[PDB]
Amino acid sequence: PLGSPEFAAMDYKDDDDKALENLVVLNAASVAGAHGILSFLVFFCAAWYIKGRLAPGAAYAFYGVWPLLLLLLALPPRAYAAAAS
Numbered sequence: 001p002l003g004s005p006e007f008a009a010m011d012y013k014d015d016d017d018k019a020l021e022n023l024v025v026l027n028a029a030s031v032a033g034a035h036g037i038l039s040f041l042v043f044f045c046a047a048w049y050i051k052g053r054l055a056p057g058a059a060y061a062f063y064g065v066w067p068l069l070l071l072l073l074a075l076p077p078r079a080y081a082a083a084a085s
Contacts, residue, residue, distance in 0.1 A: 018076070026074045033067020036060075 037060045044056030072080045 019079075022075060022079075026071045029070035029074055030067040033063045033065075033070065036063020036066065 040056050040059035040063065044059055046056075049056045075083075
């Protein structure tokens with residue numbers, strides 16, 4: 001069956017292309033999330049939040065966790081699974 005090997009070779013190609021496109025996009029999601037944590041750290045944190053304004057905290061937790069989730073949900077199952085240990 002010469003067709004079987006052809007299907008195997010083509011499958012590996014689609015798996016490589018799908019991966020590359022995922023990383024590039026997921027990275028932007030991760031950057032945006034970390035952008036939310038870094039922008040608020042700089043703007044929101046300051047020394048006024050200690051007085052009694054946790055708000056910045058939530059912004060860090062929301063945008064800092066936002067990217068994590070995005071990467072995992074925007075990442076294939078077998079991909080996020082192999083990343084676990």
